[PDB]
């Protein structure tokens, strides 16, 4: 001398929305875990 949530791309828990290019941040994803 914002909470970082780690997750995995597994359907249907976390998936990339179809239009992720246009989206940033949390909005890029959708699913049960989102």
DSSP-assigned beta bridge partners for residue 23? 21
How far, in Å, CA of 5 to CA of 13, rounded?
14
Resolution (A): 10.3
In the numeric block, the tokens 């239009």 are attached to 19
- Cα of first residue to Cα of last residue in the chain, in angstroms, is 39
Q: What is the DSSP code (8-state) at residue 16?
A: E
| Geometric angle at alpha carbon 28, from 15 and 25, rounded to 5° | 130
- Burial-class residue 29 by CB neighbours within 10 Å (0-12, 13-18, 19+): middle
How far, in Å, CA of 8 to CA of 19, rounded?
19
How far, in Å, CA of 12 to CA of 22, rounded?
21
């Amino acid at each position: 001398t914002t909470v970082v949530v780690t997750t995995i791309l597994e359907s249907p828990y976390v998936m990339m929305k179809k239009n992720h290019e246009m989206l940033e941040g949390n909005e890029r994803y959708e699913g049960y875990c989102v």
